[PDB]
Amino acid sequence: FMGKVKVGVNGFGRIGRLVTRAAFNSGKVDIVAINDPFIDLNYMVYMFQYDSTHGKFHGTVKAENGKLVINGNPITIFQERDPSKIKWGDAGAEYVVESTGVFTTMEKAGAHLQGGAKRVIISAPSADAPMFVMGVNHEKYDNSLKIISNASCTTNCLAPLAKVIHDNFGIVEGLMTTVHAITATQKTVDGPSGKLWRDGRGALQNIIPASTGAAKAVGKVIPELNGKLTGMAFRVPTANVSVVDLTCRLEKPAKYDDIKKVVKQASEGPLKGILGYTEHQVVSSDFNSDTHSSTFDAGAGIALNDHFVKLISWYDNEFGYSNRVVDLMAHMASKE
Amino acid sequence: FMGKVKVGVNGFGRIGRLVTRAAFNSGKVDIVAINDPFIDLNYMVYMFQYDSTHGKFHGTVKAENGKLVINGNPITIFQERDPSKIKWGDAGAEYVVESTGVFTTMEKAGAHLQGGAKRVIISAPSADAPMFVMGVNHEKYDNSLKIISNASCTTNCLAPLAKVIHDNFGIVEGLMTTVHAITATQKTVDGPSGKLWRDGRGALQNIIPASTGAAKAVGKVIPELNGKLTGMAFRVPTANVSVVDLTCRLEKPAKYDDIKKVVKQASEGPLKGILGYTEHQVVSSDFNSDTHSSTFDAGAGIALNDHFVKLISWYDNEFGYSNRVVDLMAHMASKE
Amino acid sequence: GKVKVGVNGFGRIGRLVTRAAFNSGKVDIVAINDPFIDLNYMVYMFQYDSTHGKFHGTVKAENGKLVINGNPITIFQERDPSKIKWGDAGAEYVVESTGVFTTMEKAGAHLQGGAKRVIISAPSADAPMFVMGVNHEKYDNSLKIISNASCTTNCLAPLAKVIHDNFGIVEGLMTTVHAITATQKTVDGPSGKLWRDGRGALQNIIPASTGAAKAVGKVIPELNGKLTGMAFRVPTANVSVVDLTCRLEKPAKYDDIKKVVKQASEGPLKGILGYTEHQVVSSDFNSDTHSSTFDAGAGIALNDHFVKLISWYDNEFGYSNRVVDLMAHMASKE
Amino acid sequence: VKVGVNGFGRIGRLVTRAAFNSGKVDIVAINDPFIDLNYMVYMFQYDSTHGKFHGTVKAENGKLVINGNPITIFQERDPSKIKWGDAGAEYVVESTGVFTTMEKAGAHLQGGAKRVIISAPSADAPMFVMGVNHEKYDNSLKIISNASCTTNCLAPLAKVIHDNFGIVEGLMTTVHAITATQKTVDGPSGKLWRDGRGALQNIIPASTGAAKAVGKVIPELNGKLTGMAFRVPTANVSVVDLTCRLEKPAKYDDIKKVVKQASEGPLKGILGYTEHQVVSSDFNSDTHSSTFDAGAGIALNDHFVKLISWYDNEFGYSNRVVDLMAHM
Ligand SMILES: NC(=O)c1ccc[n+]([C@@H]2O[C@H](COP(=O)([O-])OP(=O)(O)OC[C@H]3O[C@@H](n4cnc5c(N)ncnc54)[C@H](O)[C@@H]3O)[C@@H](O)[C@H]2O)c1
Ligand SMILES: NC(=O)c1ccc[n+]([C@@H]2O[C@H](COP(=O)([O-])OP(=O)(O)OC[C@H]3O[C@@H](n4cnc5c(N)ncnc54)[C@H](O)[C@@H]3O)[C@@H](O)[C@H]2O)c1
Ligand SMILES: *C[C@]1(O)CC[C@H](C(C)C)[C@H]2C=C(C(=O)O)COC(=O)[C@@H]21
Ligand SMILES: *C[C@]1(O)CC[C@H](C(C)C)[C@H]2C=C(C(=O)O)COC(=O)[C@@H]21
Ligand SMILES: [Zn+2]
Ligand SMILES: [Zn+2]
Ligand SMILES: [Zn+2]
Ligand SMILES: [Zn+2]
Ligand SMILES: [Zn+2]
Questions:
Q1: Atom of ligand 2 nearest to the CA of C80
Q2: Distance from the CA of C150 to the center of ligand 4, in angstroms?
Q3: Shortest CA distance from C214: residue in chain D
Q4: Are residues A236 and A102 in the same domain?
Q5: How many angstroms separate the CA of residue C62 from the nearest CA in chain B?
Q6: Phosphothreonine is carried by which residues (chain D)?
């Protein structure tokens, strides 16, 4: 019988590290193994302990006996580029968080099964793995699914809000912009990005338009919205915290105060901890290290009429998403 | 400067300096006087000569015999706090650019007529002065209008694009976001902004939502769109160049390729130099010092369907607007 | 038994002195004056902080007072500091943190409304200046108006003390690479007395003058005339670093310098002077309450007499906590 | 005349841009194997820091055409077989960031012609700094280095100060704009942990051999200078902060006179001089190696001074690589 699932992390990056932080903070899962061939054990101690965005780790972290020891818990450290060679089973890792960014198809992520992992959670959208958003469709998970995706940061922001708006008023169609903090895939100054020329341009100097499937992906976790949403992104030079800007047409008329009422109600009830709601005069830094997937900004949005509205929701793209990865794994464990 | 209208500039803040720069760069009007009671002549030289965003003035600027001398042309310097006392007429200034931002009503901007100026152009939105956007409604200007407004940079970006879309396909309704470079009204660190609390939060650290009437104001220069457009802004920590994000529903169906064709057509014909068009992989810095009001980014926009699109347009909020102020004065001069 | 304190100016330092007071409990804030921040706005500016995060505690407006952690605070809205009724509010000490009343004559305006002592949260042309850990025991009850110097002097002087005590400083030249502050501008703007300081702070490295190094010769008299320096403002929102190049009287290997700084940080300068060998960057000191943290790995010695020493400071949080510390120690001497 | 460029990064493109902008030399080849010819046009045409290229750039049946000049590209992974000879590449600029040693950089006459210039400090190639030791290059040396941007800023200033007052000792700090080796967010930099931390968020201390390297191009200063750097989140333009003890007493005004004199005479266009109230962006696209900021410096006394000099770490160096090839 499954109790508290043991977890391996592939890719000790922003998400790999903050998933580990979130697992130790929430206690919902146990981290027992980490693989990253570009960060050795002594370096992992440093990268985990000090964090420019979220501050120093509250807890203890050290290297001892070849293990990474976090709050007294030893963690097996692997250094493999090929995920099919990681001995997850030997280390007792049952679920693997696939957070490298480079193994996002079921075929590539399934490599972890060869080393004895039982299931894999891709920390990003997948071309073919079933995608889940906590609070929207995670109850559709079942234990026949050994390889799944937790979607994107942006889909985890848009989808809980889209669900409340659609449930209550009906979304005829919607177009989304996300203004998004810089990330590790960008460049400090103009450099090579042969697939995506705009993404090579210097991230500190530029507003950079970018494509994203996050809005269309909401139609996969909310099938009634299939084909009804799409969108794009602007990358801007802030270190963390991003925002969704949803322009949608509604089937039923909705005064903005009615939109506020149902979003606040959902934030206090069935979407508590997932969807937040504020009326305060907030800015992006007010959501740094905020664990919600989506926080509706009542004062920032604007209605043209009862059927055509612009809705604003904030997300700490690092911290909210990392906590959802842990939440999703604990839910999967409960369904074994 | 043969046959060019002679201009006085009230205020040598960033708009007044950039209008002055545009006048001498284009040759279209003759700056003959500048008023500013809070900036002495030696400081004017420094502020005009060095510019962090657009670089050193391409020309000569020096103080000589109590006048500011740009490219060899001497400019009379006034230091009057009471605009009704500036002796524009004695200096030969026929049109006055009212750029201080604190005399934007007709009652206050009209003070320049007392000192002998003949017309006043307010380089900002006005509560009561008729507003104009070059390329959109500037032919509605007539010689009875002694005090007018050139609207805002953002209105000057949206309105040319909205004109083309509405003219060809009909805009049923539209909602606009502008992702806006930082401005002088913002704060370096969290500070007081008693009327607009979010605007007081540190500009370098934050994405900051802000209200704007720029989209609604398009209903003034395009009367058929009255009540059909509104929007909001996100201020982000970039030094210059902003972007308009227009989500609109169209009356007639329009393939994205058809939108591109008619925008490109306008950019090469009657809106040449006002509305630009590109398909290149551009980012914000590529429009630094670009004098268009509005440059449509073909690749960055996205359509959900034939009646519902998101259109993207760049503007150097500083250089485009300042050149339009000069262009507007040149048009006024052509009527007398 | 804690001294009751009034704060004039509810800015970065006014608010963070208030935060430090309630967090440490060392003094009791009972009054705040700021004619540009009304009570409801005070709740917001104190609650939310882009740099140091949301306040850990409660803050609300109730019965016309600002209530922090259940403690009501009288709110004044006076432009003229001589008109603030500190005595009626029970404020015994006043933190003068507006930046515009830094002489003894101007800061003494608070005595007219009943304050007993004033602590200027800035350098003063004439008020005696104190740096915790360096010369604060030289304070005495006859001093009604004093200065806690600058953030930079509070970083440099504890380090300069250790180096001078142990090896002697013949002469030194200091650069501080300093985070942006409220006096700077977001884009090129008017600053008619200091032209460089009007240039846009997000885009530029900006050279600036500072009396901070010269002022160390006032809190450490043996160093009078032996230090000066300057600043570069750079576009980070908080945390700054001192870069002291000095000639030593007696020779010291760099490991000797590390030993005596580490010892000082663990003993007499604990909580004031920190010491690290970690691979730190400025973000690692955000909300760090030290006045000065020596970065052993970052400095470099040319020889046993000529060294460059690096020390970090959270210019907001270290200094604000020192203001509270200084008042606590003043109160213990009443 | 006639030059090829290995690599098309910030230094490769700006050398290429400085070549056509100055006309001192003719670019006739480019390599960089990780960017196709179409991408080359875009990267050279648009530049976030320095603006769009003042000219024309297209592709015409192969060949990158800049202002009407074909260039020919090779896209080869290792330098040993690039075929610079049949292209006309009389010189080659390294620019790749690797191949800074004389053995690894040597693989350029194996299929090429004549001389090779390394756009970085070299472990063992002879280094040169225009205006300081460039009049001591000779035709025997076919694998040379142009030092670094920072050495090119410090050395001209150090030469003038040393020639006139003698530098007993000096310690240097560079406050340096962000570079391509830094990271947008906290990421891996296994040999240099501080450099992995988020470049937008942080002042980052860093080691640099630039001040020690000055003792190599100015031998009388060997062992008399060292220093360090702080990386800060600005996009371009850096500044040198030199604190030094002088043998001969010097009023600051006398320091100003000899630096201004040098800037107008033998070091013109290499060492600049200003008393204006400048900030870093005032030097974007400035082609000087080093511009002395008179008002920013400070003296404690006649023998102990802090001297401040600005440099566009991209543009000044790139034009020195071109000026060095001009002097051969
Ligand atoms: N940063 C965010 O806001 C965010 C939010 C949600 C999802 N994601 C997604 O999560 C994934 C990780 O993003 P991130 O921001 O943490 O990136 P990151 O670059 O910070 O982390 C990636 C890590 O993977 C490591 N790695 C690279 N190759 C590897 C291999 N072969 N085996 C093991 N480890 C390897 C790298 O060393 C790095 O530490 C991406 O798919 C991203 O799209 C990111
Ligand atoms: N920010 C730092 O790092 C730091 C560190 C140490 C010392 N200091 C010094 O502390 C002082 C305050 O600096 P700050 O950064 O908090 O500046 P700030 O601008 O953030 O705070 C100043 C506050 O004073 C208020 N104020 C202005 N005039 C007033 C008046 N007549 N009466 C009452 N209040 C008034 C303003 O509303 C503002 O809120 C300055 O002298 C500064 O040099 C600053
Ligand atoms: C969250 C992020 O890592 C960063 C932003 C990115 C878009 C919105 C620019 C997100 C969307 C993804 C996608 O649409 O495929 C990738 O996965 C993510 O989580 C990213
Ligand atoms: C701490 C600060 O408010 C900000 C930086 C400033 C200098 C270093 C640029 C400090 C120095 C002062 C001085 O000693 O002259 C002024 O007061 C300060 O506290 C400031
Ligand atoms: Zn913390
Ligand atoms: Zn929350
Ligand atoms: Zn244009
Ligand atoms: Zn006429
Ligand atoms: Zn500390």
A1: 31
A2: 5
A3: D300
A4: no
A5: 20
A6: 72, 150, 174, 179, 181, 208, 226, 234
Residue B88 lies in a domain: yes
Nearest alpha carbon, ligand 4 atom 20:
C150
State whether D46 and B282 contact (CB < 8 Å). yes
Testing ligand 4's pocket by substitution, the residue of C97, C150, C219, C234 carrying the most ligand atoms inside 8 A of its CB is: C150
Technique used? X-ray
Nearest to C203 among D281, D296, D297 (CB): D281
Q: Measured between alpha carbons, how far is C312 from A143 in angstroms, rounded to an integer?
A: 52
Strand partners, C311: C242, C294
Strand order in the sheet with C59-62: C59-62, C65-68, C71-76, C28-33, C4-8, C93-96, C117-120, C145-147
- Ligand 1 site residues (CB inside 6 A) read A 10-16, 35-39, 81, 99-102, 123-124, 152-153, 183-184, 317-318, 321; D 187-188
Chain A residues contacting B via beta carbons under 8 Å: 173-175, 177, 179, 197-198, 201-202, 205-209, 228-232, 234, 236-238, 241-243, 245, 247, 249, 281-285, 297, 299-302, 304-305, 308-310, 312
Residues D273 and D297 placed together within one structural domain of the fold: yes
Q: Which of C27, C127, C151, C220 is catalytic?
A: C151
Indicate whether A117 and A173 sit together in one domain: no
Three-state helix/strand/coil letters over D241-304: EEEEEECCCCCHHHHHHHHHHHHHCCCCCCEEEECCCCCHHHHCCCCCCEEEECCCCEEEECCE
The reply to whether B122 and B169 lie within a common domain is no
Alpha-helical (H) ranges within D46-192 are 149-165
Q: Smallest Cβ distance to C54: which of A46, A56, A286? A: A286
Task: With both helix axes pointing from N to C terminus, report the angle between B319-333 and B153-169 in degrees, rounded to the nearest 10.
Answer: 70
Which residues of chain B make contact with A316, given a CB cutoff of 8 A? none
Query: Do residues A246 and A176 touch, judged by C-beta distance below 8 A?
Result: yes
Residues A120 and A258 in one domain: no
Is residue C166 lining ligand 2, measured as CB closer than 6 Å? Answer: no
CATH of the domain at C130: 3.40.50.720
Residue B235 lies in a domain: yes
In a domain, A1, yes or no: no
B211 and B173 assigned to the same domain: yes
CA distance C289 to C292: 9
Residues A160 and A92 placed together within one structural domain of the fold: no
**Domain that residue D133 falls in:** 3-148+318-327
Classify residue B100 by its DSSP letter: S
Task: Collapse the DSSP code of C117 into the 3-class scheme (helix H, G, I; strand E, B; otherwise coil) and give the result.
Answer: strand
For residue C326, give the nearest of C189, C167, C149, C110 by alpha carbon: C149
Name the resolution in angstroms. 1.8
Burial class (CB within 10 angstroms; exposed 0-12, middle 13-18, buried 19+) of A178: buried
Residues A335, C35: Cα–Cα separation, whole Å: 60
Amino acid at C277: E
C181's CB contacts (< 8 A; 6+ apart) are B188, B189, C12, C233, C315
Note whether residue B1 is domain-resident: no
Report the number of distinct structural domains present in chain C. Answer: 2
Which residue among B38, B40, B182 places its CB closest to the CB of C186? B182
Structure tokens at B68: 């500011």
- How many contacts, defined by CB atoms under 8 Å, are there between A and B? 131
Helix (H) or strand (E) holding D199: none
Task: Please confirm, yes or no, whether B157 is among the known catalytic residues.
Answer: no
Residues near D281 by beta carbon (within 8 Å), at least 6 away in sequence: B52, B53, B55, C199, C200, C203, C204, D237
CATH of the domain at C168: 3.30.360.10
Report residue B303 as tokens.
């359509």
3-class SS of residue B39? coil
Those residues with Cβ within 8 angstroms of residue A193's Cβ, 6 or more apart along the chain or in another chain: A187, A199, A200, A201
Q: Please indicate, yes or no, whether residues D47 and D59 belong to a single structural domain of this protein.
A: yes
Contact D169, D183 (CB under 8 A): no
